[PDB]
Amino acid sequence: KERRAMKRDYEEYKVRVNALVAKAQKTPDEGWTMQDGTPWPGNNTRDHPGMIQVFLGNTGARDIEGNELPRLVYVSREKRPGYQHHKKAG
Amino acid sequence: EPLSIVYPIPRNKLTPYRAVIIMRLIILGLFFHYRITNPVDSAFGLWLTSVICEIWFAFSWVLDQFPKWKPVNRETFIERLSARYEREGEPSQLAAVDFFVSTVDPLKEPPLITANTVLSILAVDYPVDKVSCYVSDDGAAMLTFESLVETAEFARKWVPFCKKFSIEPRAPEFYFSQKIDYLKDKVQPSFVKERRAMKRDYEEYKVRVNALVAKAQKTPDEGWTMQDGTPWPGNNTRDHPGMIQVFLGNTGARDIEGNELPRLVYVSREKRPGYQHHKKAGAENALVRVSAVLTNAPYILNLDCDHYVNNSKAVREAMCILMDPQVGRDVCYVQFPQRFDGIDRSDRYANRNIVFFDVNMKGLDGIQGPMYVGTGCVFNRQALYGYGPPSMPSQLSFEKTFGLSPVFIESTLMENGGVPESANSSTLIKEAIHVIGCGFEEKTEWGKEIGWIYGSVTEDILSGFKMHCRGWRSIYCMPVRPAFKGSAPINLSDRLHQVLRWALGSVEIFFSRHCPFWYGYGGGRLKWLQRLAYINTIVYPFTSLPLIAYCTIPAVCLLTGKFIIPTLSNLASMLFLGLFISIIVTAVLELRWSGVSIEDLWRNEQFWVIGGVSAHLFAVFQGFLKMVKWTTLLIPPTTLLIINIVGVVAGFSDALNKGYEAWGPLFGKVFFAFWVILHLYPFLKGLMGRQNRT
Amino acid sequence: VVAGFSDALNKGYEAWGPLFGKVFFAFWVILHLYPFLKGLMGRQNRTPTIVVLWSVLLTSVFSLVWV
Amino acid sequence: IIVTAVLELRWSGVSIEDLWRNEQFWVIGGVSAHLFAVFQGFLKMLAGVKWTTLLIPPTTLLIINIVG
Ligand SMILES: OC[C@H]1O[C@@H](O[C@H]2[C@H](O)[C@@H](O)[C@H](O)O[C@@H]2CO)[C@H](O)[C@@H](O)[C@@H]1O
Known part of the structure; x- marks a missing residue:
């Protein structure tokens, strides 16, 4: 069912x-x-200030029954022209 | 702005293709000098038969290679057509279309398939x-x-x-x-x-x-x-008055939302004893007459009860070529390729038949256009009546050429089509019932020179030839989607019968008045390069008879003669080498531009030879006498297999008379008989076998 | 390899052991890199025409060089 | 042996490959299974096996044949 x-x-x-x-x-x-x-x-792929946000955290959405769920974090770096940004290590 | 564009081969793959064939002709000519300056091979009888048979093959190749000259490709767009003709504000300015479906018996062919086809037509x-x-x-x-x-x-x-x-x-x-x-x-x-x-x-x-x-x-x-x-x-299948009815029309059932749906018409003919009724040729003519009285249209579409529409934009694609003011002036019909589904990965019997559609049709499209096949074509109404292409230089005559009905005679006078004086529905129904009488086409020209032509079984070939003789042109279409799909035979019994049926029709046309050899010369208007294309399609069956003769020489020579041509004199080696290489180079170039896979080419060649010794043979002899069982058709192929396998093995046994070296011809005859038992082996053994061939 | 054979078996007798070893080494080399280097082309196998093509090429080359 | 086999297939309706499968299967069964069975029944008569050992007889015959 x-x-x-x-x-x-x-x-x-x-x-x-x-x-x-x-x-x-x-x-x-x-x-x-x-x-x-x-x-x-972020309107330019090569220029966007860094951003951070939290979803489904301890203080926020809860399960239907009423319990809690693991927190989630979303982060985006900052990029400006004239520098080098290593792909994965950075 | 143009609605469609046409472009030729990019010329990178064209010049080498032409240069290969032109050189091949010279090589073939020189080769015959050697075969005519060597009059003795220890047996004059074998020499006489071999030379004559070989000469025929050269002529057959000539009649088949040239028509593939000057290929062409086309393209079409749909966005521009909608913007130009269907601009908002005012009503649509498109043309009307009609569909025809033919059925014969409910029990032999299940009705569920027919119902599905009808539903598809209404969802365009x-x-x-x-x-x-x-x-x-x-x-x-x-x-x-x-x-x-x-x-x-x-x-x-x-x-x-x-x-x-x-x-x-x-x-x-x-x-x-x-x-x-x-x-x-x-x-x-x-x-x-x-x-x-x-x-x-x-x-x-x-x-x-x-x-x-x-x-x-x-x-x-x-x-x-x-x-x-x-x-x-209708209580008797051989006697029932004609009936007509209308369903799902404009004035009747409506969709759930409240909109309208295409009208559906059901019509049945009248049959009485003592008269001969043509099959599938009088039915189409009857539908055309009935449709004109009820709802005149400028185009006609024909389909079978097995095929169904696969693309919803097919109608728009077809109309984008016929409605073009410039290129649409002279067009009789537009041909669409036919495709089949439900086929196994290993097409043993070459049911798809891609070589003819993907090679021959494209090449022949360059001169005038493709050939009528029978399904998937849009026919101009004026072309069917037999008037003639535009831009080219009494009641009694009309009565004797069309019929006695006055309504039908006046209907053709309309520039576009429709109801002239919008009469009551009852009168139109009565006229339609009266214009389908059993003896309506007594003094008329129907069949002889108007509409579908009676006579040979494969009437579609004959009908197209007459139209082309008056200067009309046809076009080819190849949308990305198939736009049409049907069914194909599964068992070999149907496939062999299908090949036999086509051959018989060609033989009948050859001996009739409608023969391209001495027909259509008066008035010209037919390109000389297409009349040759017509000749090949009519005289192809006769190529089978010499083919069986050639397949017999290897066994006879290997048994007693063992000598066909004199030993090379240091000059034939280069000529033989040049001949073998020439065939290879032409094949690869064709594959490069044609796009067909190498494997499929081999299947077509294998299928051709087997299909010639079985049915094409009967058409030339059964038909000469006329002017077969699954077990009986397999008789001629079986005889060759037994002779060519018992003889070859016997040759080895008698080769023990000499030493380890038996002088070379063994490989000469071994690959000569392998070829015979390499193309004919996989079918005769494959079609029957026992299981898994182990 | 084929040409080598067509030479050695023409005249040399009792000297066909080193020929066998060379042929075996060539086969070892060929087997490792024929399957992957070939199968990528075609659906499963283009043997039907490939076998006849190789045979005709071999016989034609042999006859031409023999002449 | 050949003509008789063909006639049996004609009327029985069985297939040739099934006949071949049965014939060769009978050979293997005789070497290993029936050899041990005949011996085990002789002991209890006078008195009044694992998978690994069952394949020993067949293994020996294959080795001696190929080496010889
Ligand atoms: O002959 C009319 C018949 O032709 C069919 O195409 C044939 C073609 O005519 C023949 O030369 C070639 O060898 O085979 C193709 C079929 O594979 C066509 O398919 C029929 O609709 C038509 O009635």
Whole structure:
């Protein structure tokens, strides 16, 4: 009974990633804008200030039952012209 | 701006190809000097037979190589066509199309396949106010009529679902039974929910059709009766008044949402004893006459009951060439390649037949155009009537050339098409019923010079030849998607019969009045390089007779003679070496530009030889006398195998008379007989075998 | 290798042991790098025409050099 | 031996490859399985095996043949 619902939910979730990719295929002339109504901080691949964010942390979303889940961190470095950035070691 | 472009070979792979063939001709000519200045080989009889047989092969190659000169390629776009003709604001300015489907018997061919084909036709990507469908059945049957009613009911749900999600293919039977991941590029949010419901509905519909088919296995003693409470008009297969009906029309059933769907028409002919009815040639003519009275259209499309549409944009692609103001002035029809599915990886019997389509058709497209095959073609209405290409220099005549019906005579006068005075529906129905009489084509020219031509079994070849003789032109199309798919024979019994049927038709045409040898010369208008292409297609069967003679020399020589040509005098070695290398170099160059794999070329050659000694033989002798069982067709091939294997082994035994060196010809005859038992071995043994050949 | 054979077996007798060793070494060399270097071309095997091509090339070269 | 085999196939309906499979299978079974079975029954009569050892007889015959 739970397996059938889980399969249906996975398929529904798998459709939305394809939808997102299809939308992202084409870029606007001015640039990407966030949902809140502000421009995406990184508009140039070779120039973007560093960013850090935390999702699904201890103080935040909780499971349906009411328990907690491991925290997740997303980090993006800072790049400026005129320097060398080693691929993986850096 | 142009709607389509045509470009030739990039010229990098063209000049070497021409240079190879031109040099080959000189080599062949010199080789015959040696074979004519050596009059003795210890047996005059063998010498006389060998030289004559070889000369024929040279002529056959000449008639087959030249037509492949000057290949050409084409391309088309669809975005520009929509912008130009379908600009918003005003209504569409596109042309109308018509479809024809022919059926004969319900029991011999299952009705489920026919139902799937009908559904596919109604799901095309074209305005619903233009397309139309027609269905014709020769033998009246209640199952076909009842099956169509069920299909129409299910079409209400099937149509809107396909259009919204743009799914392909649009045939439920051939679409659901696919293992390709169906969640590949879909982006709609509610695709899964609707898909589950549709699958359940299709299964229920399938069960209903099965029950209906099984119900009619028995026949009531009194006879079949309709639901309303009246007898079925056609109770005798050889006698039934013609019937006409309309389903799913503009004024009738509507989609669930509230839109309209293409109209469907069901028509049956009239048959009476004491008259001869042509098969598949009078049926097409009858449909054309009926369609003109009901709904005139400028184009006609023909299809079988097995093939189905695989691409939803096929109609637009075909229309993008015929509607071009410049290149579309002189075009009779557009040919589409035919493809088959459900084929194993190892095509033993070469059912796909790619060499002819991917090589011969492209080469012949350069002169005038391709050849009519029978399915997948769009025919101009004016061309069928036999008027003539444009831009080129009484009632009694019209009555005697077309018929006695006045409505049909006045219909052809329309520049575009339609109903002239928008009369009541009842009168049109009565006229349509009256214009399908049994003895309507008594004093008319139908068949003789108008429409489909009666006579030979392979009437499609004959019909195309007459049209081309008046200066018309044809075009070839090769979309990325197949756009058309059908079925192919599985067992060898059907394949051998299929080859035998084609050969007989060619023989009949040769001995009839419509012979290219002395037909069409008056008035010209036919390119001299295509008349040669026509000659080869008509005289190909006769090439089988010398072929059997050549295959007999190796055994006879190896038994008693053991000598065919004199030993080389230091001059034939270079000539022999030049001959062998020449064939190799031409083959590789053809592969380089043709794109066909090397393996498939070998299969075509192997299949050709076997198919000649079995059926093509009968067509020339059974037909000479006429102007066979699976066991009986296999007789001539079996005889060659036994003779060429018992003789070759015997040669080795008698070779023990000499020493370790038996003078060289052993390898001379060993690879001469290997060739015979290298191309004919894998089929005769392969087609029967026992199992696993171990 | 083939040409070597066509030479040695023409005249030399009792001197075909070193020929056998050389042929064995050549076969050892050839076997390691024929399969991978060949199979990438074709679907499974182009033997049908390859065998006849090699045979005709061999016989033609032998006859031409013999002349 | 050849003509008789063909006629049997014609009416029995069996296939030739099945006949060959059975014939050669009978040979191997006789060497190993039945040899030990005949001997084991002789001991209890007068009185009143692992997989590894079962293959010993077949192994010996193969080695002596190839070396000889
Ligand atoms: O003869 C008419 C018949 O031709 C078929 O193509 C043949 C071709 O005519 C023949 O020269 C060649 O050897 O074989 C192909 C088929 O593999 C065609 O397919 C038929 O539709 C047509 O009726």
